[PDB]
């Protein structure tokens, strides 16, 4: 009952392989810091920690296929796969956006349905909805924020929250 980075990938896999509902992916946003010389403040910034993707036009597909094999270097690429990939380079200032609001106030933010996403005022929820997601969840942990996404509409179950609680650190 005090997890470290070394089991993070296993814990993300456990969360959605064992979950009773059809979750598409899980992401862990890790806390980092950005000291601001101009004001002397040490602001929390959330960035990519790890992730686990489960899953289910011509120019776009070719653009996506070209980025994938270019990454492979150093057949279809689906909307949710792309969203997952694109997520890797996002970051969030504490209190800002879906992961940031979750962390700042130590919140569970559960957005179920297309309208909950588009009405959230969070650009990441808007983006997820564009890529076909209908449920997005952020849950604040001791070391960051766990995010879940699904192309299905999923209500908050105590079973899932029980799994989250058994797989991450809480203050």
């Amino acid at each position: 009952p005090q997890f470290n980075e070394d089991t993070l990938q296993q814990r993300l896999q456990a969360l959605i392989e064992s979950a009773g509902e059809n979750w598409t992916y899980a992401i862990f946003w890790q806390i980092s810091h950005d000291f601001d010389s101009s004001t002397g403040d040490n602001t929390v910034i959330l960035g990519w920690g790890d992730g686990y993707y489960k899953g289910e036009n011509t120019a776009e597909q070719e653009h996506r296929k070209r980025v994938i094999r270019e990454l492979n270097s150093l057949e279809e690429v689906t909307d949710t796969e792309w969203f997952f990939l694109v997520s890797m380079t996002q970051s969030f200032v504490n209190g800002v956006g879906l992961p940031g609001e979750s962390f700042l106030n130590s919140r569970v933010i559960w957005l179920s349905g297309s309208g909950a996403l588009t009405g959230s005022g969070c650009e990441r929820a808007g983006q997820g909805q564009i890529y076909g997601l209908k449920t997005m969840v952020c849950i604040a942990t001791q070391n960051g924020v766990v995010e879940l996404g699904s192309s299905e509409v999923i209500s908050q179950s105590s079973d899932l929250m029980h799994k989250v609680n058994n797989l991450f650190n809480f203050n």
């Binding site: 990519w48 992730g51 993707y53």
Partner: peptide
């Protein structure tokens, strides 16, 4: 660090996709 965290995750995702 985030960039190697990215690389590690990217590696796994690409590897798991080939399946």
């Amino acid at each position: 660090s985030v960039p190697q965290a990215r690389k590690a995750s990217l590696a796994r995702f690409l590897e798991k996709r080939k399946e």
